């Protein structure tokens, strides 16, 4: 036996031109969530996509991405993505499909085109929309009929009600000092999420020299990242937000209904109304996509009269090709299916059978057509139901384009030839237009040439932005008479069912995504499952559980007793409740959401699938049959009845409160302006009786006086809890996906966790405290002292060196870690057999085997790469001393943070941003009484409350 096997090597037959072997290469592509593309810098290691970063030249990117764009790598490398053309489940040929499609359309060319239809998602692609217009001009009796379940139909109808025309409303939050969100979850992924979060956090970040901060007001049923990052939150029912907006309009002076509300709601109303009419052009009122068009038009009227047009809100030309009511188009399409007037049906993406509301009976209406065409990257429920399923190329391997939330039309650049073949929607429409075997690259180049030119195409492909495709600003005329001539619907009596996109699976497209299913959800920390999220008071009043829920209300005298009572209120999560909403039964387990509104239940869309992959095959319980086309986001009356049968719902936290400890430090803005050290002064005055702690250690440590000392600073004031840093860390560092059973055993693998904490003076509606906890890389590391083989040691640079080749189990590093950031490979968690996951693995980070410990390394792949680059530049210039710049190292969490809460840099360099943030008075480290000297310090959350509401 030898030390190693033979280990054959495989070079190229022809070397690539612009590639140096071993140097990772960055390509500017575009990834779409709901049709609105965002610019991404996807890293090609050896001709294949491995890590998605942000494009700083791109409007909705700004260098940071969201969790869906971060997990698009594993969505691409899903092993259950479709490989062949399926005629009736049997494999077929694309050429034979195009022959049959040409025969079907030349049989349908006897008429003008009445039998041929279409069903796409929200299309912002200009080339693809031009091809749809060409197909509609060729067949004038064909219709577009686009639909996606998470859409902006209500925003489109609100714009049409307010202005009489379709506009795109983009918000400038850098110039906004008061933000009002009427169920507007703009700090969650969607149109313009990264730009909105970046501008909001840039205004939110406060220093010694800072004089102003922004204030956020939210009304919502489901607490979210937006309600987490809000100074004030009022939990109304989701159908009462219309009456809230009417009362706000009436007290602001514009047309609205003087609705009657709770005393807390009218106090929050007058707090908003007093904070407004004091920032004219420095305020913004945002309405959610789930809110009715009357709420959208009323927010438009409030922003118009408040002077916010041209300063914080902006009205542009519509960017989503043809704006329409997608749910009404789907109702018209299934009415045509029931009438039998449809013969040819073509779909691109969407998964309409799974994603349609259950009152339309999409499968039964679809079974009557003669032939169907589907294209959705998977053999989904619809593709299994349809004839003629064609695999769709991933955006990371497909040519195309996509407009942003403000309009950019950015080119979707592939980083690889498609693994399984498969055609794009441009190729499908080229084959539909009598041009088979056409290249999507040639199609998008033919569209973009003679529109921006060859030099414009080359500039746009090198960059990620076309400079001449921005939506121009317009001045639409507000129609206050049409706003006033509205029914203004009131909230309905009974239990309402609020339909919500999932934070991890979105609408269920990411259902097989292992990173997104294994990822703990915001506000609930759930994994691999769906739940009926509700308030504890609602759970008691509905299921009759033997508790009080008035024992969560109190003060700091009985705060620990209230936290113990919340721990007793826990565990009950998982009780399966039979919910009869409108002729349909879901029978979903419940989960306690303390921030949630009373008499409401939120069910996350995107679960209960049947034709997903091996990962997430039957996770969760489906909500789409319960969902109706009349109210696709709200509910009126639901029979939620407890039916025993407690299900195993798995969380990664299992304790929800801060047990009287100085971990999440909260301050106010005015006392921060007076003295920025008062948070730490009050904490150490209550703990020790002195303003400063005289922490004394018996260990000297190392020096760090003339060397590159690396540290992290996490801003708790500018963290929303979007888990994009966690998905980026998983993608960069090859963290394994463990099972739901392995998380239930307590063995989740995440180098960074976002710790929600529910601290407040009433636990039936607390404040949400999200904080990223990774390895602090402690200078005096209790994990390092207890390692018997020196598998974890400390650097000259100041990093704890978790060596996996050396780690021999013994699991003591994790017991001496006070933050428990270290994750152990108890079993063979990393996949060894899936070639797609093997391609998804980062070549520059090791893949851990069973029996070793792993934790956060400050992305030492990037640290070592920048150090090697700096030393190589130093000896090539003869400087005899390497200098690493402040922006030279950017970790994965810092890059993919859309807010910029995480900053990485040098400690000993005083001009670095981390040293400037650590020179602030509200910077602190966790558990300083343990003499660890953490290098990942935290900036205390500084709130900005209003005197009419809190002070």
């Amino acid at each position: 036996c030898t030390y190693q096997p033979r280990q054959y090597i495989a070079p190229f037959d022809r070397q690539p031109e612009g590639r140096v072997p071993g140097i990772p290469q960055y390509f500017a592509s575009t990834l779409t969530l709901g049709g609105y593309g965002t610019g991404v810098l996807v890293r090609s290691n050896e001709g294949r996509p491995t890590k998605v970063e942000g494009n700083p030249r791109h409007p909705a990117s700004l260098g940071g991405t969201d969790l869906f764009a971060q997990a698009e790598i594993l969505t691409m490398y899903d092993p259950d993505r479709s490989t062949t053309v399926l005629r009736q489940g049997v494999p077929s040929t694309w050429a034979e499909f195009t022959t049959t499609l040409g025969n079907a359309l030349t049989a349908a060319r006897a008429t003008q085109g009445a039998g041929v239809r279409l069903l796409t998602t929200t299309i912002t692609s200009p080339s693809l929309a031009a091809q749809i217009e060409q197909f509609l001009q060729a067949y004038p009796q064909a219709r577009w009929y686009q639909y996606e379940p998470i859409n902006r139909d209500n925003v489109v109808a609100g714009a049409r009600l307010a202005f009489g025309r379709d506009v795109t409303t983009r918000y400038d939050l850098s110039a906004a000092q008061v933000v009002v969100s009427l169920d507007a979850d703009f700090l969650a992924p969607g149109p313009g999420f990264v730009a909105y979060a970046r501008a909001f956090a840039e205004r939110r970040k406060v220093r010694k020299d800072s004089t102003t901060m922004n204030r956020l007001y939210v009304v919502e049923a489901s607490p979210s990242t937006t309600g987490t990052a809000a100074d004030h939150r009022l939990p109304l029912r989701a159908d009462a937000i219309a009456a809230f907006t009417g009362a706000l309009a009436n007290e602001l002076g514009v047309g609205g209904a003087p609705a009657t509300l709770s005393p807390k709601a009218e106090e929050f109303l007058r707090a908003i109304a007093r904070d407004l009419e004091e920032h004219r052009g420095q305020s913004v009122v945002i309405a959610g996509d789930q809110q009715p068009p009357i709420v959208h038009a009323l927010a438009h009227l409030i922003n118009a009269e408040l002077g916010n047009v041209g300063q914080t809100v902006f009205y542009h030309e519509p960017v989503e090709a043809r704006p329409t009511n997608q749910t009404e188009e789907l109702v018209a399409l299934v009415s045509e299916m029931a009438a039998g007037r449809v013969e040819t049906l073509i779909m691109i993406g969407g998964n309409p059978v799974y994603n349609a509301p259950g009152d339309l009976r999409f499968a039964d209406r679809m079974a009557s057509v003669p032939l169907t065409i589907h294209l959705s990257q998977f053999v989904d429920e619809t593709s299994a139901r349809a004839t003629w399923h064609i695999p769709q190329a991933h955006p990371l391997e497909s040519w195309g384009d996509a407009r942003a939330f403000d309009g950019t039309a950015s080119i979707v650049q592939p980083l690889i030839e498609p693994l399984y073949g498969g055609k794009t929607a441009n190729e499908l429409l080229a084959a539909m237009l009598g041009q088979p075997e056409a290249e999507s690259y040639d199609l998008v180049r033919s569209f973009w040439l003679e529109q921006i030119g060859e030099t414009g195409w080359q500039v746009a492909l090198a960059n990620g932005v076309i400079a001449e495709t921005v939506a121009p600003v317009i001045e639409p005329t507000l129609n206050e008479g049409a706003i006033r001539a509205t029914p203004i619907p009131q909230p309905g009596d009974g239990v309402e069912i609020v339909f919500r996109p999932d934070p991890s699976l979105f609408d269920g497209f990411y259902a097989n995504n292992g990173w997104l299913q294994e990822l703990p959800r915001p506000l609930t920390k759930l994994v691999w499952d769906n739940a009926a999220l509700m308030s504890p008071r609602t759970a008691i009043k509905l299921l009759g559980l033997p508790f009080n829920a008035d024992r969560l209300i109190g003060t700091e005298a009985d705060d620990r007793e209230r936290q113990q009572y919340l721990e007793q209120l826990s565990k009950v999560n998982g009780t399966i409740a039979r919910i009869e909403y409108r002729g349909g039964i879901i029978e979903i387990p419940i989960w306690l959401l303390p921030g949630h509104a009373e008499d409401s239940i939120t069910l996350n869309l995107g679960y209960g699938r049947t034709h997903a992959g091996r990962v997430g095959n039957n996770v969760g319980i489906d909500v789409y049959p319960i969902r109706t086309s009349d109210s696709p986001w709200f509910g009126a009356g639901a029979r939620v009845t407890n039916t025993g049968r407690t299900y195993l719902l798995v969380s990664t936290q299992d304790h929800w409160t801060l047990e009287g400890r100085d971990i999440y430090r909260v301050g106010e803005f005015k006392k921060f302006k007076e003295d920025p050290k008062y948070i730490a002064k009050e904490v150490y005055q209550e703990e020790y009786g002195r303003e400063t702690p005289n922490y004394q250690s018996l260990q000297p440590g190392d020096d760090y006086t003339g060397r590159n000392a690396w540290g992290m600073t996490i801003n708790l004031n500018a963290c929303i809890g979007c888990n994009a840093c966690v998905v980026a860390c998983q993608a960069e560092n090859n963290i394994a996906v463990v099972g739901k059973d392995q998380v239930s055993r307590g063995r989740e693998m995440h180098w960074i966790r976002i710790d929600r904490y529910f601290a407040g003076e009433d636990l039936d509606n607390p404040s949400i405290y999200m904080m990223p906890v990774n390895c602090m890389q402690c200078e005096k590391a209790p994990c390092e002292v207890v390692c018997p083989v020196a598998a974890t040691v400390h650097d000259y640079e100041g990093l704890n060196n978790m060596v996996y080749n050396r780690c021999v189990g013994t699991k003591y590093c994790s017991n001496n870690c006070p933050y428990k950031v270290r994750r152990f490979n108890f079993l063979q968690y990393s996949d060894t057999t899936t070639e797609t996951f093997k391609l998804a693995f980062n070549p520059d980070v090791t893949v851990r085997i069973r029996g070793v410990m792993e934790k956060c390394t400050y992305c030492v792949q990037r640290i070592s790469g920048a150090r090697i680059a700096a030393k190589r530049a130093a000896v090539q210039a003869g400087q005899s001393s390497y200098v690493i710049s402040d922006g030279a190292i950017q970790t994965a969490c810092e890059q993919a943070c859309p807010t910029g809460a995480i900053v990485f840099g040098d400690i000993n360099d005083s001009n670095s941003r981390v040293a400037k943030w650590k020179a602030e008075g509200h910077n602190y480290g966790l558990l300083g009484f343990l003499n660890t000297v953490p290098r990942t310090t935290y900036l205390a959350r500084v709130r900005n409350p209003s005197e009419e509401l809190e002070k």
Binding site: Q413, N734, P843
Partner: protein, 164 residues
């Protein structure tokens, strides 16, 4: 005996793979793509053709450091066959039938710099459809960055001044 993380599941730079048809995890360039902030608008920078003819020019002015880089890249990639002095006398031409072109002849003395860039990037005449054909110079687009190819052409001009 250990064999734990010695040959990992991740794919290394030139690791073979059974997933792809050519048996290689290293993937070629997608036809028609460019990296981030690597612009290709200067046609003279990436090929020697402007209007269908030779140019005899340079996209950037000559520098002593550029000429030293061109000398280094000439000694690495071009002096194996053409020789260090550029007279076409080398062990490759001695052992085989290469016989490369002398830079100090009249045809290469009055040859354009754009023609030098074209012959580095692409090479010479390929296989003709009539009476056969073959390629000899073979082109060096994949191995040499185009700025370094222009530096090689500048060093070719320097060697032509050296031997005249």
């Amino acid at each position: 005996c250990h064999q734990d993380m010695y040959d990992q599941q991740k794919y290394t730079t030139y690791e073979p793979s059974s997933f792809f048809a050519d048996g290689r995890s290293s993937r070629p360039n997608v036809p028609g793509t460019t990296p981030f902030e690597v612009v290709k608008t200067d046609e003279f920078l990436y090929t020697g053709l402007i209007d269908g003819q030779e140019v005899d020019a340079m996209p950037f002015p000559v520098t002593k450091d550029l000429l030293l880089r061109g000398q280094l890249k000439y000694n690495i990639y071009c002096a194996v066959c053409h020789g260090e002095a550029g007279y076409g006398a080398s062990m490759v031409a001695e052992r085989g039938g290469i016989v490369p072109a002398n830079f100090h002849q009249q045809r290469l003395r009055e040859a354009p710099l754009s023609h030098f860039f074209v012959v580095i990037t692409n090479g010479v005449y390929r296989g003709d459809p009539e009476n056969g054909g073959y390629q000899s110079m073979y082109g060096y687009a994949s191995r040499i960055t185009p700025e370094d190819r222009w530096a090689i052409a500048a060093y070719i001009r320097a060697l032509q001044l050296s031997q005249n």
